[PDB]
Amino acid sequence: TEFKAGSAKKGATLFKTRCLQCHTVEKGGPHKVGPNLHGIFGRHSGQAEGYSYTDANIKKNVLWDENNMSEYLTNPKKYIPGTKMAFGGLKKEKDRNDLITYLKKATE
Ligand code: HEC
DSSP: OOOOOOOHHHHHHHHTTTTTTTOBOSTTOOOOSSOBOTTOTTSBSSOSTTOOOOHHHHHHOOBOOHHHHHHHHHOHHHHSTTOSOOSOOOOOHHHHHHHHHHHHHTTO
16 A cells, blocks of 8 residues: 555546546536535545435445545445445556546545
C-alpha cells in the first residue's frame, strides 16, 4: 500500500470511460444508475440527496476515505455483497490512484 498520487486529468479521462456511464461528480449532476459522488469523501456509505441505496450498502456504512474507497473499488461486489454497483472492480492500483486523485479533486 503506497498512494503514489496520480494526475487529476488522467483520473478524469479514466472516470469518463469507467464510471460516468452510471455516476455524476459535478454538484448539479443528477443521480442516475447510481448517486452523485460530489461530497462522498468524509461521508458514510448511503447518504446522497434523497436517493435509495441497498440494504447491504446501508449496513456497510463505510466512512469514504482515500484508502477506504480504493479498497471498495478493488472488489465492490465482495465489499458490499448485494450492491447495485454492477461494475466489477479496478484491478490495477496505478489506474485507481489516478482516478482517486481526480475524484478527490472534484470534491475539493
Ligand atoms: C453502474 C453499473 C455503476 C458503475 C459503472 C460504477 N458504479 Fe459506483 N455505484 C453504483 C451504484 C448503483 C451504487 C450504490 C450501491 C447500492 O447498492 O446502493 C454505487 C456506489 C458508489 C459509491 C458510494 C456512494 C455512497 O455510498 O454514497 C462510490 C464512491 C462509487 N460508487 C464510485 C464509483 C467509481 C469511482 C466508479 C468507476 C470506477 C464506479 N463507481 C462505477 C453503480 C455503478
